[PDB]
Amino acid sequence: MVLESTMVCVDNSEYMRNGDFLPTRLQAQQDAVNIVCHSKTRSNPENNVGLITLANDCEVLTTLTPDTGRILSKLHTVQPKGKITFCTGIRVAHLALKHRQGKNHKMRIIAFVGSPVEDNEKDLVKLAKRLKKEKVNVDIINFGEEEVNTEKLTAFVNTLNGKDGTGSHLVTVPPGPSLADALISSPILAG
Amino acid sequence: DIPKGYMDLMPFINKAGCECLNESDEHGFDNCLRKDTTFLESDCDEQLLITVAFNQPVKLYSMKFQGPDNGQGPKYVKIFINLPRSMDFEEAERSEPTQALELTEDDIKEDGIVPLRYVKFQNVNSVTIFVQSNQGEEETTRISYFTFIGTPVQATNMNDFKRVVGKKGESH
Amino acid sequence: GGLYALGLIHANHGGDIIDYLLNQLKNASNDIVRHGGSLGLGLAAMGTARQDVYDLLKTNLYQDDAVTGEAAGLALGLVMLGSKNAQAIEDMVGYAQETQHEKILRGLAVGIALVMYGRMEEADALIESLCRDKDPILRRSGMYTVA
Amino acid sequence: APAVDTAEQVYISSLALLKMLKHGRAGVPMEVMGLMLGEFVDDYTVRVIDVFAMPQSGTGVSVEAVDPVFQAKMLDMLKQTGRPEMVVGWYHSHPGFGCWLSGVDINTQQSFEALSERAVAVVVDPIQSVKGKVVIDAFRLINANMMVLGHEPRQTTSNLGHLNKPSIQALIHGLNRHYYSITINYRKNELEQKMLLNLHKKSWMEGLTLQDYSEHCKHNESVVKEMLELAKNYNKAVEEEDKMTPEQLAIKNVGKQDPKRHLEEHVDVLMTSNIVQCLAAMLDTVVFK
Amino acid sequence: GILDAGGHNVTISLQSRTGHTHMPSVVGVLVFTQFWFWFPLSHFLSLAYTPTCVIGLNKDLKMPKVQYKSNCK
C-alpha cells in the first residue's frame, strides 16, 4: 500500500552468466525481478516499477511504469554480455527516479549486484551521501561470484540510512542452490 | 491577517504532488501544513527542499514561512516555479532562483508574513522552497507553518469539455 | 469614477484631499475603483513627490491587476513628476520588462515619461536606454520621455 | 457586464503561426483542427504560445473531433517538458473558404466557451494565405443574450478599426451578429526572428563569387542592346518635343515607355551589375594571393 | 468640446504667461494624447485649459467693477 516507485536495477554483466545458482544467475535475477516487480504492484495497485541494466553501460530499458507486463517482457533478451558499473547505476536509477510522474510516491530502489564491483570506497560512500540528502531507500542484493558481502557494498547500505534508518537492507543471498525465496522472504515483503 | 481579496492556498495544495527532501521520519512534511505545533525538521542536514503542487494554476502574493523561535527556523529561502522535474540539492544551489529571499528574524515569528514579488508568480503550478540555513545554525532546521496566499487562476479543464449545445454526428 | 472625479476638482492642489484619497484608495475592491483611485490620487498630488502617496501607488502597481496598473503607473509618474527619483525610474522601468499586461506598460510608458519632465539634459540616459529596448511600449515611453 | 474591449488581443507566438499554417497545408483539401495552448493573462489579452494538432477524424471540425483521450494524454506529456499551459482555444483551417465560422463551427465555439468565457477560436486558410498575407482571423462567440446591450461590447479604447476593417467575405457569414473578430497580433521576439532569418540568408561564400563571365558578357551585351533601342525612342521622344500642350503630351503617352522608365531603370541594373562584379573581382585579387 | 471649452473662456497654452513651461498644462496634453489607448484619460486636457482672463484685484479681497477697454479695431 505504501506508495513507492521501485526502480529495479538488474545486472546483466558477463559474470552474471555463470550459474552458481542452480539454473543460472540470470534466471535468478529474472525469477527474482518477477517477484519484486509483482510484489510491489500487489502491495499497491498505484505503484510502478522500472528496470535499469547495469553492465557495460546504464541502459534504462524500461522507464518508470506501473504496468508489470512491460517490465517482464523487456526482461527477456537481457543478454548478459557486459561489465557491471554500480557507481553510475544508482545515479541513473535515481536520476530517472527524479522523473517520477507522480510526485507523492516514496522512493525505494532494488539493485541486483551479481558481479565484483570495482568502485573506490570513497566514491561509493559519496554516492550514498547524496542519496541520504534526497531521501531514497535502495536495497542491495548480491548474486553469483563476488567478494562475499563486499566491504565497499556493506559500507554503502550502512550509510544508506543509519542512525535508526528505514533499514534499506543489504540482503545477502546464500550462494549456491537458492531461489529468490531468500530474496522474497526478507527484502520483498520488508525493505 | 491576509491581504484584501486573497485566500490561503491550503485547499489548493495537491497532496499527491507535494514532496519534501531531507524530511525527518519523526516529523514529516504533513506536519508543517497544519496550523498546529506539529512542525517539520530536516534529518540529514540543515538544507531542505519542500515542494508543493497546486490543482490548478494559482497566483502567489504572500507566503508565511514561519519557524520556531529556537533558532531552527528558516533563514534563506530560494523559490522556484513550475519545475518540469523534481529538483536536486546540488543543482538547486547552482540554478538562479525566481526570488532569492533573506528571511529576517521578524518574519519567522508566528505573525510574520513575507511578501513575494507578485509579478514573478503569475502562473505557478508547483513551487519549491529551498531552506539554505536556520537562524541558530542548528543541526536541523524547522518550518512551523508554511502556506501560500494568492488567488486561483481560472483554468480551462479540457478533461470535462463535453458538448453543451448541438447534435452529435454533425460535420462542416 | 467619483473618486477619479474628485481628483480632477482638486487637480494640482489636493492639499487635504490627498489624505482622504490615500485612505480611500487603500480600501477598495481592487478593481476599477482602484484604477480611478490611483489616477485621482496621482492627479491630486501631481508633483508633490510625496513618499507616503508614492509607496501606496507602488503597492497597487505591484498588485499587477492590469487595469489597476494603467492608472497606478500614471499616478506613480505624476506624483514623482519632475523628481528624477533614481528609485522611481529604476523601479518603474524594472516593472516594464518584467510584466505582462501590456496595459500596465501603457501607463508606465507615460508614467516614467513624466518622471523626467524638464531636466532637458539631466538624465539623457533613459532617453537612450529606453529607445534601445525591444519592447515597443517601452520605446514609446523612451520617445515620450524625450517630450 | 464584462466586455471584450476591442483593444483585447489574441497574441500568436511565432511558433504557433508556423505550426498552425503547417497543419492547414498538411490536409489542405480537407479541414484540419487542433487545440491551442496559451494563457488568459488578463481580460484584455489572450496569449497563445503553442498549438498541438488534434488528429484528423471523419467527423470534421466539430466537438466530436476533440478526442478526450488524445488531448488528456498529450497535455499530460507536454507538462513534463516544461509547457504547463492551459487550453486557450481551438483552431481549424478552411480550405479557401475564408476567415468565417459556419453554423457547426459556432456550436463548437459555444462548447469551448463553456469551460472558460474567453476561449478564442481562430481560422487559418492555407490556400489564401499563400503569400506575405496570412488570413487568420480570431473569433469569440458574442452570446446572443446581449442583443439588449451593445454587440462587440467594447468600452474605452480606440484600436477597433485598426489592424483591420470588417471583411466583407465574412460579414455575410455572421459577424457582429453572432461572432466578433479579435485583433490578432504576433509576439515575435528577438532570438526567434534571428533563427528565422536563416531561411534565405546566403552565406560567407556568397558575395565573393564573381558570377560567370560568359553569361555576364552576354548579359551586358544583351542589356546594352536593349537600352540602345530605348535611346532611339528617347531621341525620337525628345527630339519630337512636340509643344501641342506638352504637359498633355507627357500624359497622353504614358504607358511605361521610352522617356525614362525603360531608360535609366536599365542603367541602374547595368551599372549595379558591373560595379558589384568589378568590386568582387578586385577584392578577390587582393584576398586570394 | 474643444472649440467651446469653458464657455469660450479658457485656452490651452503650455507656455506660461511669463515664458515659462506650464507643468500642469503640458502634462495635461501628454496624457490626453494617450486617449487612443484609454478613453477615460481624455479629461486630462482639462489641465491644459488656462482661463484667458484678467482680474482687476486691487486690494487683497476687493473686486472693483473696473471698466477697462480693448482695441478691437
Next chain:
Amino acid sequence: AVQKVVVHPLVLLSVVDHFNRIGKVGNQKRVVGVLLGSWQKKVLDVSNSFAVPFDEDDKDDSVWFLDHDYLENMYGMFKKVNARERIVGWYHTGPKLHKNDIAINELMKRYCPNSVLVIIDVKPKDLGLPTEAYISVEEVHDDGTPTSKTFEHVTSEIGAEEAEEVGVEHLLRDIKDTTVGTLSQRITNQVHGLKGLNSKLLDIRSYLEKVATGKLPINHQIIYQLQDVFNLLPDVSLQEFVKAFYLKTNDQMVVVYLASLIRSVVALHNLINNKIANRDAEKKEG
C-alpha cells in the same frame, strides 16, 4: 550516408521554444529532443520535433536520462497527427558536443538506424547557419589508428516548404531585405563575405596553431586537405592573366561609362525641362 539534412524553419523555432521552456526556470545546459522528418533520396528532411525529458550530471558525464516511454508515446501521437514523419535523429542546443552524445546516439539508433543529430546553437545569433548535423560511424580508420565512436559530419542546410515559407515571410515582414539587392545591399554582401573568410581563416589558424603547438592531434587527414586549399590559390601575378583581367575590367568600365553618360544626359534634360517648368510658371504667374 546523408548528403544533406535540410532543417525546416519550424524545428529551429520549436527548439528555441524548447530551450526557453526549461532554461527559464530549470537553468540547464543543452536541451535534448527528437527530430522527426521524411526521408528522400539521401537528403533527410526535418519537418518537426518535440521535447524529451533529459537530465544530466557534470559528474561522470554518463549519469543521464533520456526517457524512452515519453519518446515512444510522443511519436505514437505524432504518427497519428501526421504519418509522413519518422524519428530521424536528435537535437541539442549545447553549442559544443558532450561526452554523452555517443551513448545517447546509440539509443536513438534504436529508433532510426541512420540517426543524425542536429546541434542547434539556439543561444548564439551570429555569422549564420545555427544547425550542425552529425552522424555515427565506427571505422577502422584505414590509416592504422585506434578505433572509436566519433561523430562524422554531414552538410547542413536550412530550407522551407511552401506552408512554413508563407508564415516565415510574414513573420519577419519588418527586417527582410529587398530581394533586388541594389548597390547598397550588394556591397554589404561583400564586406560580409570578407568578414567571414577572415573568420573562417582565423578558426583555421587557431587549429593550425594548436597542432603546431601540439595541443591537438595532427589529423594526418583533413590536415593536408587544408594543404589542398593552399595550392588552389590563383597566382594572379601571372602576366597572361594580368592582361586578361584588365581586358574584362576594361570591358566593363566602358559599360559603366555608357551607363554613366545616359544617366547624365537624362539628368541635364530633367533640369532643362524643370528650368522651363518653373520659369514658364514664373512668367505665367504674372
